[PDB]
Each structure stands twice: as structure tokens, then as C-alpha cells.
Symmetry: C2
Amino acid sequence: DSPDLGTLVPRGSMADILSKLLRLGEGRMVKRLKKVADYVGTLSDDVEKLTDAELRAKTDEFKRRLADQKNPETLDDLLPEAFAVAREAAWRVLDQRPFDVQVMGAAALHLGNVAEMKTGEGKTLTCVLPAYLNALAGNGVHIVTVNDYLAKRDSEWMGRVHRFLGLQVGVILATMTPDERRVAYNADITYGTNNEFGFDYLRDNMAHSLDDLVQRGHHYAIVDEVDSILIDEARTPLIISGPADGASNWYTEFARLAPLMEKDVHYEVDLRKRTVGVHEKGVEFVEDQLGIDNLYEAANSPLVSYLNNALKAKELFSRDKDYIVRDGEVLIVDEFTGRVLIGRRYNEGMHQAIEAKEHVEIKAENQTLATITLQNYFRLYDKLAGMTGTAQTEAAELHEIYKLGVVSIPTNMPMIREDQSDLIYKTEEAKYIAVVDDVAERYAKGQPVLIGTTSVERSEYLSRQFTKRRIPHNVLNAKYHEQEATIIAVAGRRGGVTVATNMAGRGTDIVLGGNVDFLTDQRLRERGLDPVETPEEYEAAWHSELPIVKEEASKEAKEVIEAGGLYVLGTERHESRRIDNQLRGRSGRQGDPGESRFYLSLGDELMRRFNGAALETLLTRLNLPDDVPIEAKMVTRAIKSAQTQVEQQNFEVRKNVLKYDEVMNQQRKVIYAERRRILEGENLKDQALDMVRDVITAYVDGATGEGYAEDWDLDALWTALKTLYPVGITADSLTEELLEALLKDAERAYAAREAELEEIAGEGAMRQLERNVLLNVIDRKWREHLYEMDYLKEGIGLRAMAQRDPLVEYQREGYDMFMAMLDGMKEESVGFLFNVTV
Amino acid sequence: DSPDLGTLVPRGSMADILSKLLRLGEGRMVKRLKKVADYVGTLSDDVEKLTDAELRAKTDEFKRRLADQKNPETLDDLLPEAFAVAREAAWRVLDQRPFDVQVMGAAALHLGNVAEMKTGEGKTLTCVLPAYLNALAGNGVHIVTVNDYLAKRDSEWMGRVHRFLGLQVGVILATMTPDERRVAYNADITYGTNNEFGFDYLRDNMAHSLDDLVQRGHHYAIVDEVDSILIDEARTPLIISGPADGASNWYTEFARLAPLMEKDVHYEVDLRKRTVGVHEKGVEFVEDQLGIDNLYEAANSPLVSYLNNALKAKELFSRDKDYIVRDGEVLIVDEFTGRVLIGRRYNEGMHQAIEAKEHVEIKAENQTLATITLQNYFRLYDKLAGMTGTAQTEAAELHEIYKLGVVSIPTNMPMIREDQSDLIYKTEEAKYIAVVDDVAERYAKGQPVLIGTTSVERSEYLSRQFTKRRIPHNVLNAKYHEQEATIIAVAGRRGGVTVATNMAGRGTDIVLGGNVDFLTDQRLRERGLDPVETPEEYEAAWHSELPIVKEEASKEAKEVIEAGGLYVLGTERHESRRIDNQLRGRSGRQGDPGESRFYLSLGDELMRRFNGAALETLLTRLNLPDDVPIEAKMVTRAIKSAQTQVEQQNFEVRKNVLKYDEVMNQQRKVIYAERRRILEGENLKDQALDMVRDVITAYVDGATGEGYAEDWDLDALWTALKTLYPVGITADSLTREELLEALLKDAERAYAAREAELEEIAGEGAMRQLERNVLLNVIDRKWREHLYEMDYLKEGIGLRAMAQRDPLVEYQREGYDMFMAMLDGMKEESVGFLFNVTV
């Protein structure tokens, strides 16, 4: 709740006023961000005057100014100076000094926003400034890129600047091991993909020892290509899947035991409470059949539930009454309708028991073992920002899901690219002969072309035409990213002809004359040099050779400027206007000249999914021939419409994925919390006993209800309690008082048990036993929740009536099993706490 | 405005109240019809007592009771008696006396409604009653059936009752000559298809002579299978096309002559009015070039129009401003957007003119020569009625378009057919094995099965599945009506299996134990007996054969009833629930036991048009086995809605077809009215002269609006008036608002001059014949030409649908403009040829 007068960086209250008059397009934020940038610039002499050793000592200066309690300074306080330091470092190390519009964008990202920075504005380098500043706080900065090649590359590339400044830079990649990941996460700044970050988080919350954890919290994340990761890729959740994890031999084993058991002799049935209770003879019978001395003895085999469940299966569920068998499938049927309630299975391992009862084949099965959406994953960070050339069109969604504002940073030079109107053809065949001719023309004239398509299949068709016209070219298909960067790096020398499927060659700049940085790095690496492996020599070689590389390329750059800049050819519209605009954006960087144009047809994938065929017959009827561009105002409105409709479809899909994810997200936050505190080693005696208390209290509450005199079933209550623990008093012992009695007995039984462990290998043995058993129970019963939650999602669709909203229905039913799951968790825990083999 | 107390049949004002109350299912009309029926029944006794000779004579009593001017009676006064007489005739002739509910429905049909009588209620014989009554008026009745086979059959079968009663019954068939149709139309009752009626109407209004007309007005039509014809079939217009037969040679020849001509010397452009005038000298240049004496001398060659267009083309339309040339087309582009306004062409021959100017290849085309929608065709009749088992769900459209109401007639016996609910399968594979297993089990138990499919391939697929399984069956594919009817007539014997794709074998009832009525006739026909060709012999043989065919059947009719009656198994769902219902309605005739069920799946064509595949992805993920029927409100919902969407789509197309047809329908009523006048030898002397007056007046109006004094071009006005007629006074002698009066008087005298020149060549009123030849020739050529342009206008107007514009409104404006332009050019060119044509 802060003031603004005489404060360079918008503090907090003032930041909101800007971060929100944002959506309103006035640009006070930009005006602000510009003032910050100017001021940073005025510090440029002060840093210029310093040795390499005097820079980099600055890291330690800032670090110490951040902790001294006498003269407290914050990151906002340090921003002018730290940005000056990072900027000068970048200049000395890379030979590239961040422009003013980069410093602006830097401020915007420190302030937690999406900086919309046009292609060729220096995204990757801008990034260094907020990454350095925040890295000083000492908690980690995560930098998210679109694939492993780019993560490794940016980490090694830019990590030069960070490393020059004292900091340590990490990268996570698909191949790394848990130990390698650890180190990368312990760095001051860590690069990686949403994938690797997400899954690491998933594996962490499945870990069995605190030592296996690889991440260290979620403090600050800068999401490179934000629209691609947070909007586009968000439609898909991350799922670690896996098999059931056993427990099938028991279902079969108890299905065989249950029928060898005389009703009223081994167990009793409460035909209208809908319950089963097992007698002394029954317990003992099961015990001797398994050569076991207690049904809660072997850890992680909840033999009480299995038994009970199997008896319920035998006694309480009737074949052809409640359910029918159909293909090794237990299908539940309506009361006296008699008709299969599709999607519906039985609860808390009862389905399995019924299956086992009906001798149904038991099959191999996978299920969710962990999940998070990219949405809820990135919502974990205390601060969040991102960068991209195209984000203003996702502002509303970025604000609603992430609280991320979008600031358009002005470009370094004025964009002068000619973005031409679509040429719409009648047929695919027509469009492509006309495409090939423009490209062949362009080639002969020297101009470099980038032609994008929308499928690998259409890239090879276009390259077959390209060879049938003898035009030397490459196709990039988005598979081998590195070798595709190499091509891209020289896509804008003259003669250049590059065909890119989807957005292939993402994030390497198509520089006219050639990418001077990319090429300099290549000279050095082919000679076996490395920024990390051979640091001093890479640096020295860099400074020496960059100007050479810059020469031979930028001599040819004047020639490429002559020929019109880059020609961007669109062969199809993408699944959103955003991406088309991204492709156009590949050209015209840094005020370079350049052309863009899309060729389209009523026969394109897009149009074919809507009304293109219908239009093509009409236009063929109106005697309009194939090789003529359509100027029809209505074919135009039709195209815009098709793409808009695709965009909205994807949005709905996203919106759904997340709204169905919130349910599970809430539940996992609780389950992860539980697992974490066990991992941490917390003393749980208080909760262990609370559960014992809780469980006894629940059981008394059920067997006693409201009945006055004799009425209470103490024998049933006693037997049900006696499963879990050695009850040290009789019902006769003392004949709401019945509960206060049993609790007190149970507590002593507990301290007795605790000392039994002390004797077995004690001095906290019961403290460990508590943790060990809990974690076990939680995991086993959580796995089963997820497997049952899987079936609930898939099915919830069909059970949607004449007005409902199935998400309410799913939410209702979903939390229900979640509570049931937690109750069952407590029960079996106290069970094992007393009776487990040590 | 009519009373009703003491009147049996609802007269005018009161039939109205009953018609209106109809759409609210209060059942008030059904009550009245029942009352009408009952009274007819009290009249049986009197007709039972008559000779056949005396019954046939009843027809002549009726006709003469209608033409009586002293004690005048209407068809409504005759309904009780004519109905009773038709009813008893039928009993005597067919050994089949129309039931009470048949008499009800008949009154409903006479009253101009759709009687909804269920399948097997006797639709086809019921209709004999209102047709007979109405036929008495002597203007003809049209019975419309779905195909030629059915038209021929009902005309011969039921014509037995009409011919006995003294009437003549005709049929029109796709194969008949004009002369053959004409006789058929002259009959008291004529059967036929919407196609045959429609096309005869179209062809009539193209006739070049009164003798050629085949039809004789549209007095009363009973549309059999109303929903199939007036709703489903309405999607599609009737069109006669042909070669444009254009004046391509003249456009070419005038494209040549236009540049040889010199501005201000041969002709004069007017950059403001968008006008060209050919000078004295030009007229003679073209005259010499073609070797002609007057530019109106050659019949059907409006050389004045062609020449003026070529010049306008030359002077008034600019290549690369107003239009461009691309791939042998003229494409109009905007003044400045510069963009190709595709669709658009120029008007009144200007487009051709410009094409020729640009040395463009002139391709021969086919064009519309006449068209009507079924809607506007059937709107022609004074009375309209219809029969069907399923009308009630189309009531609103039937009322909006046709002003037809729908009375549900109650059935003879209570309907006891068991209509089972859909079995829906996850896959197409599984549904078909369920179907075959069912057909298998029911073959074994004796019971006849009708299996419906929605394509021929699926029908064929099911044939093989059956054969693979030793079940003898039949497939009817809708191709061959007489033989598929033959299979149908026995589909209801023990062991019947019949695969009917789409609705094959419509109009023949699947009678249990076998179709006695059908089989008797088939016998009689094998013996060379024919109801028209050997009337008396057919009758006598029919009377002895029927009771026999009946015996031979009845034994196993008992057995098919025991077996459960007909079983109707549907294989997928049709494009509307209505059709689905028609299939079900094949079972359960006249009280008979029966059962229907449809087997559906999420891979049916219908579902696959929509979300069907999505559903089976879901269902498999839920582990439901392929062969377990799906009962889920959500899947029932999705099947309903696929079908509903199809209905809705069909309804919209239907709405669109008629919307666009109204514009042209108005236009052709005018033109048809013209052609008739001419074709009927009417004296057009006055019309001729009004056109003469009309055209001269407009020329004057155009040369003499403002200016007042000698600010007029009397040179141009004279030169142009001279194209049309021998102006006998020429300016000078006049120099007001007169000159119009002067010049008219002059033309009037010139007309009498012409007229005499004609009597001088051919004589005694021969100029009358010139006004007729010339008017007809000019209309037909100019309207034929208008259709050609209206062809192009209709196609490309769908390309004008921007946000808020309604393409129908623009199409009306422009279409109506061309229509009016066309009309003016009709007048002009007519006076030209009238004055100057070679005789």
C-alpha cells in the first residue's frame, strides 16, 4: 500500500493503476517505463569507468545491500544500478549493448508483466536484465523456453553475461538425471521447457525422500514465447501415467475366501444399514488361510478392507439385480428399469471386489499418477512475466488466468515492412502454381524467401515443385531444432529459399546477410570451443572474430537490403491470426525493409473444415477460372470467420481443461502438503493421536447414533474397534461417557505401542513408524483416488440432463470421494499404527 | 358470408371457423365430418334399391341438377347423394364399400383440406368420393400420385368406379404425346405426377398456338401423398432448359460496324443522359452495309437495338475503367475500388455488346426457358386437397404456403401396433449383427419382416448378411415400381422378409396373409384382361376371382396374425421423423397386431454428419461393450437433434426456393397473360395503337422536357421517330406542348396507311394477324432473353450477402428493373416491326 511521489520504479499501489489503465490503451505505463529506462541510461558512465573485476564485484555489493538491516534496500531500489551493471556486462561480453527499448522491456518484466517486444527486438538479451536483478535475492529465476535446444542454447549464450557477473546458470533438459537437475535448480538462474519444469514438479510431489526433490520453490518465472506456452500449449495437461501398482492378487484371493465363509458363523450382515461385520472366527479363519497373525500386520496390504469388501460383494450386491456382467465388465443397472447406467462403477475398491466375485478376467491397466495444467503450474510462482512479439490479442485471458498485464514496448527503429493483402485462389492446385512462380521470380532476383506451410506433407509437395523448377532450398519440419537453426541462421543471405512447416526455426532470428551471433558461435564451436567447457578462450575468440564474421556477412547484407529485405510467404492461415502475424513478423526486423504475403484457397484445410467447397462450386459456376485471385468481399469475410471460429474453439477447450482442473488442483494441494511434511520429517505424534481420537469418535458416533437404553450395539462396536487396536477394557467394564472412556483406553494402548517400538529399535522409532505408515497409506489411497477420478471425468459428460452444468455434478461427486478417501485414510492409518510388522 | 343452421355440410363462413379451430386440435371439425358421414349412411337404402343402369343414371341427374337455374343446387347440396352413389358403386364394383371413416375423410377432401388418414385406411378408394362429386362440375379433377406406375394403377383400378358411374378417367405419363395428354386432360378425372402436371403447364405457356395447349385450367387437385409432394419434393423447381438461340451473329456484326462509323458524322453521343442517337447518314450506312431498306424490315432482328448498343458500347463504356477483360469474360470493376465485382453483368444486351466490342469468343449456352416451383404451380388450383398418413407435423407450412388445413381422420379399427423404442449401438458393426439376429429369430417363428434402409449399399450389405444365414428375402431398391409392388403384395405372407431401401414400394399395402386386392388383378392381367381395354370381361372375372384369392389367403392370414402381424425393423433414421413414422405405419393395418422398432448406431450416416464419432470415442473410454444398447438421455438427445437439424435445414432450403421464385412468378403471370390473349386470336388493334402512342410519347418526353423554346433537338427526335415509322409531317410545319398531339395524329394516320397496305397484300383483316405474329414473336424473344439474364442474376446474388443487406431485396430491385426495361423494349420493338416488317 505504497506511495509514488519521487519514486523511480512504480512501487505497488501506483503499479496497479498503470498495470490496468493498461487494458485501456492510454500508455502511461509506457511513459513510466520510458522514464525508468532514461534514468538507467544516465548511470552508464559510472559503470563504463569500471574494470571487469569492479563490475561483478557489483553483484556482491548489491547482494549485500539487499541484506543489511540498517539501510534496507529492495530490488526496486537496486533496479537502476543493477540494470546499468547488467547492460554494461552484456556490452563487454557479447559486444551487444541493450537498447533503450530493451531496458524498458526489462523494467516491465521485473514488474511482473508480459513485455510485447517485436521480433528482432532482442527478447533473449532483454531478459538478462530482470533475470540478473531478481537472481540476487538468491532464490532462483526460471526462464522458460519452447524446446530443449533453445533452453540449452540461451542458457549457454546469455549465461556468458550472467557468469561474467558472478552468477551461476543452469539448464534442465529431457535427458538429465535427478542429480543433474538438482544442480541446475541450485544455480542462480535456470533455463528449461514448461515440460521439464512441470514434470519435475510432478515427480517432486511423488518423491519418497526429501533428498530426491530437485526443484527449490517457485519464485520468479520469465516465460519466453508467452503466447505459445501459456495460451497455445495450455490446452494440454501434463500427465505422468503408470500401471495400477498391484493389489489384484488380493481381490482374487478374497473373492475365493469370502465364499468359504458361513454367514452368522464367520461374519454377520446388516441387511438394511447395508454393512458387514466380521466375527472372531472369521478373523481367525482368514488369518490361518494366509499364515498371518493380524490383518493389519503386513504394511501396505489393507486386508481388512479387502475382506470386508469381498463380503459386501457376496452379501449386499446381487447379480442381475444391481449390476450385470458383459465382457469381463461389471456394468451397473438401474433399480427396476433394468437398463445399463453407462459410465458408472462402484466405490472404494468395491468394483474390483465385484469383478473378482464374478471370476472376471483381470487386465493390465494404466492411470494418472500425477497431473497439473500449465495454467495451475505457472500460477505457483510468486512473480511471473513473459516475452513475445504477439500477446495484446490474448490480454484478457492472460489477465484473467495469470494476472499478467501486457505492455507493448515500442520498437528500436520504426517498422517499415509491407504486409500485403491475402491472395485467395479457388483451389489448392491453383494457389500453389501461383506460389511457386512468385518464389521462383524472387530467387532469380536474389531476394530471400521464407515460405511457411501448415503440414510436413505440404512442405514436401512444395519442395518437390521447388526442385521441379530447380530452385535450391531447404525444408524445416520442426524435428531437428539445432540443424534447423543452422539453416535459419543463413536464411537471409541472397538466394535464400526456406520452407518452414508450422513455425519451424522458432527463435533464431532470420538476419539479413546472416545471423552474426549465430555464425560467430558456430565458427568457434566447430573448432571445439565452448562457452562453458572452454570459457576464457571462447570469450577471447568471440571478441577477436565477431567483427570478422560481421564483415563478410554485412557486406552481403547491403545486397539483401537492395533486393527488398526478407520476403515472407504464407501458404495457409494458421489456427489463429496471432500466428500468421508471427510469421509476417519474421521479416522487417530493426527497421529493415521487407515484404509479407499470404496465398490462400477455398480448398485449404481451414476452409475445407467450413464452407470452401460450397464457395468453389459457386465461383466455378460464375465462370471464374482457377488461376485468378478472388477479390470477393464475401470470400474475405468467410476466411476471417473460419479462423475466428477455430480460435474460439481452442479457447473453449482451454477454458474447459482448466475449469475441470481446479477441482483436482485443490485436492492435490492438500495431498502434496501432507506428503511434504512427512518428507520434511515433522513430528506427527500429535496428528497420529488425533486420528486415533478422530477414528474412535467416528465409530462411537455410528454404532450409538441416538438410541437411548440397551439399544446400542456394543458387540458390533467392540469388534469393529478391535480390528484397529488392542482395546484394553470390556463393554461390561462400565455398565457422552462411552467415548471419553474408549479414547482414554486408546491413548494408553498407544503409549504402550510406542514403548513396544522403543524396545524393538527405539528413541523415536514410533516417530518414524508414524511417518512411514502415513506416507504409505496416503500414496496407496491417492493412486486409487486418481484411478477412480479418471473414470469419473470421462463419464460425467453422459450424465448431463435437461439443464445442469456437469461441472457442478463432477465437483459435487468429486469432493465426496475425496472426503471418503481421507476418512478411509485415517482408519487404515491407525490400523497400521497399532498392528504393522516392525 | 354464409349461414349454417339447417345445413349439413359446413358452407363458407362456418367452414372457416372449423378450419381455424383445426390448428388447435379441439376436434370440432372431426365432429362435423362424423355428422356428414352418418347422414350419408342413412342414404344407403335408397341407392341399394337401384339397378346398375339406375345408379349410372344418377350421374346425369346430378349434372342436370347442377345446371338447373330454376331450383339451383351446389356441389355441397349434392355431397350426401353423390357420395352415397359413389359409395355404393364402389361396393358393387370393387366388392369393397368405403367405411364410415372413409366417408369422413372424403368430406374433408371435398372441403379443401388434407385428410390425414393412416396407412391402410383406404386413402386411394376414399378419394373416389370427392373426385366424383367434383368431377360432376365438368371442369376436370387432377389426382396427383408419386410416380407414373401409381398414376396408371389408380387411374385403372379406381377408374373402374368412375367409368361405371359414367365418367371418363385419364392418365398422363412421362411417355405421352401432346395429343395423348390432351385427351387425358379432357377426361372428367385425370391422374398423374407433379412432374407431368407441372411440365405440361410449363410447356403450355410456351405453346405457339392454341391447338397445342394440353391442359384446361386448374380447377381441383387432390394431391396423393401430400407430404411427400408439397413438402419434401418442393425443395426442387421444375425447369425446361435449352440453347440460348441468341443473336450472337448480330452482336458480332455490329461490333464490326461500330468502329467503321464516325462520331458526329454518323451518330451523336450524349455524355450526360448516357445516350446515343444515330444520324440520318448512319442509318443509311448500316442500311447499305446489311443491304436492307429499313432497320425494322427483318423479322426478329431488332437491328435498331443492336446498333444503338454497339455505339453505347463504343462510346459510353470504358475498358479498364468500367470493366476489364480477363479469360474470355467481361468483368465489371468498381469506378474506384478497381476490384472485380464478380457476378454482375450489364443490362439489355449491353453485356453481349461489350463482349463483341472486345472481340471476345462468344460461347453457346443453355438457359432457363420456363420454370415453376411446385409451390407456385399448385397454388394455381381453385380447390386443393391432399391425402397422407403423415401431415399433422407439417400443418403450419401446409397452411402458410398452401392455405391447406390438416384434419386427422380417426381410424376404422383401434390401432394396436406396438412401436418399440430405439436400440442404439456404439458401432455400425454391432447394430447390424443385432438386426440380423432379430430377422433370423423372427424368420424362424414365421413372422413377416420389413427392414428399411437409407441407401442401396446398406440394403445390399443386409442382403448378403441374410444370405450368409439362409434367410430367403427380397430387396426392393426403388428402381422398378411394378415389380417391387409385386414383391410388396406378398411381403406379409408367412416367412416374409423384405428389404425396402428408402421407402420402396410406396402405395401398395403390405396386407397380412397377402394382398388379395393386388393378387386378383395380377391374375386377371395374366389372362390379357385389362380394366380399360376389356372392361366388361374384367368386371365379371373380378367378381368370381376375388372370393377365391380371398379364400387361398385367409387361412394363413390367421397364421400371420398368430405370429404377431408385420414386424417393421428400421435400420437407420430418415431425414425427418415423419418418414420414420411412415415406415412404422406399414405394420398394424386395420386393427392387425404388429410391432415396429428401429436399430440405430453412432456410425449411421446421420450421426456421422454430426457428433456421432465423438460419442464412440467417449463410450469406448468408458469400457461399454460394442453390443450393449445405449440408453442415456444425452445420446437420445444427440440422435433427436441430428435429425431435427436435417429437417430444419430442408425447411430452410424449401423457404429459400420459394422466396426467390416469387419474384419470377409475378413476372411470368404477366407474360403468360400476354401470350394467351395473342394465342386466343383476340383483336389487338387498340393495344397495338396504345404502344404506338406510348412509344411516341416517351420519345417526345425525352427530347422535350426542359428548355421550353427551340432549345429542343427536333432534328434528333425526328431522326429517331423515323426508325419506327414513316413520319409524314417533319418539324418545320409545326413552328407549344402540342407536337405530341401533332405527331400522334400523324402516326395514327400512318397506322391506317400500314393497315391498308396489309389488306392490300393479304386482305380482309390481315393486319390483325400482323399484330398477333409480331407481338408474340417480340415477347418470346425478349422474355427468353430476360430469363438468360435472370439465370446469371440469381446465381451471383448470394455473393452480395454482406452484414445487413438481404440479398433477396437487391435481387428483387434489379430483377424488377430488368423486368420493366424489358417491358418497354417490348413496346418499342413492336411498333418498329409493326410499321416496317417485310410481309
